[PDB]
Amino acid sequence: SPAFRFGTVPNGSTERNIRNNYLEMHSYMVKFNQRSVQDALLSLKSGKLDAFIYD
Amino acid sequence: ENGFMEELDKTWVRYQECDSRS
């Protein structure tokens, strides 16, 4: 019921793989996609995002 | 069969804010 949150960097092998196997995850996570790893880290670190996914 | 109803209930039942309280 509460909205959960997870995202990853776009144009990645991770994102392409995701789109290949799991569509819904990709289509949902596009909103949670982040500019850069330092910035993705900004979304995790300062709050406003729960989980981060990366290499 | 096509899930037309499921999507219509999904539209008109908002589900936004609530939970099992206890």
Walk across the major sheet of chain A and give the strand order. Answer: 1-2
Q: How widely separated are the two ends of chain B?
A: 36 Å
**What oligomeric arrangement do these chains adopt?**
part of a larger assembly
Helix content of chain A: 40-55%
Order of helices and strands of chain B: H
- The share of residues in helices of chain B is 40-55%
Bulk shape of chain A:
flat
Query: Strand share of the residues of chain A?
Result: 5-15%
Radius of gyration of chain A: 11 Å
Number of helices, counting only DSSP H or I runs of 4 residues or more of chain A: 3
What structural class do helix, strand and pairing data of chain A support?
A: mainly alpha
Write the H/E string of chain A, N to C: EHHHE
Number-wise, the strands of chain A total 2
Global outline of chain B: elongated
Most extensive interface, residues per chain?
A: A-B, 2 and 4 residues
Q: Which sheet architecture does the biggest sheet of chain B show? A: none
Question: Could you give the count of β-strands of chain B?
Answer: 0
The description of the largest β-sheet of chain A is: 2 strands, parallel
Q: What is the CA-CA span between the terminal residues of chain A?
A: 29 Å
| β-sheet strand percentage of chain B | under 5%
- Assign the structural class of chain B, choosing from mainly alpha, mainly beta, alpha/beta, alpha+beta, or little secondary structure: mainly alpha
Compact summary:
The structure is cut from a larger assembly and holds chains A (about 55 residues) and B (about 20 residues). Chain A is mainly α and about 55 residues long.
Give a topology summary.
The structure is cut from a larger assembly and holds chains A (55 residues) and B (22 residues).
Chain A: E1 6-7, H1 13-21, H2 23-29, H3 37-45, E2 51-52
Parallel strand pairs in A: 1-2
Chain B: H1 4-12
